[PDB]
Amino acid sequence: EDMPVERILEAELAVEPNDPVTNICQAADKQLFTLVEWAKRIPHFSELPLDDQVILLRAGWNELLIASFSHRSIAVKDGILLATGLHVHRNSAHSAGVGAIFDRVLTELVSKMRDMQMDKTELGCLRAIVLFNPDSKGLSNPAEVEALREKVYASLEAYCKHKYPEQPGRFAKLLLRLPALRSIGLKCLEHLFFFKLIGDTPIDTFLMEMLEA
C-alpha cells in the first residue's frame, strides 16, 4: 500500500545499465549518478527533507553499490560484473592486493545471493532497507526513517511469504546478509580512503565527493 514492492522493483529495473581497483573506482563513480536516480524512485525518499536525502545516501552509497555489483554478478563464476560491461576476476583482484576483501564479496554476498536465487525485488527491498538507515548521523527525523524502513521490510516479508511459501525462513535469511554487507562496506571504504590517501588510484569527482568530511 504505502511501500509497494512493485515500485521498489521498478526502481531497480529503471536504473539497469589495466588496474582492477581503478576500474572499480571508475564504475563506482558512474554508478553513484544512477544510485541517485534509483533513490528518487524509492517511495517516499523524495519526500524527506533534502538534507536527510543527502545524509542517507552519504551513509549508504558504498553498501548500496556493493549490493548491486554483487547481485549483478550471480551469473558469473569468480568475479564481479561492474555496471560498465567489465568484469573483475578473483585473480586480478588478488594480483592488485585486494584479494581478501574481494573474496569476502564473492563468498558472503555473490555466492549466497546465487544459492538462494535472491530476486530483483528482494534486492531492491534490502537496498531500500539499507538506504532508510535511521542510525545515520544528523538525520532531522530518525523515527520517520525507521518507519519507512519498517514499511519496507513488512512488504518484503509479505512478498516472500506469497512468492516463496515453501521457505518460511527466507525473509530472515535475506535480512541476515545485511551484517556482512555492513562489514564488507566498511572495509571497502577504508581501502578506498587508503587509495586516496596514497594517491595510487585516480578517483573521479562524485566518488571523491563521497569521501570528503
Partner: peptide, 10 residues
C-alpha cells in the same frame, strides 16, 4: 556536497 545536492534537485 555539491554534486549530490544538484543531482537530487532534478
Amino acid at each position: 556536497h555539491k554534486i549530490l545536492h544538484r543531482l537530487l534537485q532534478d
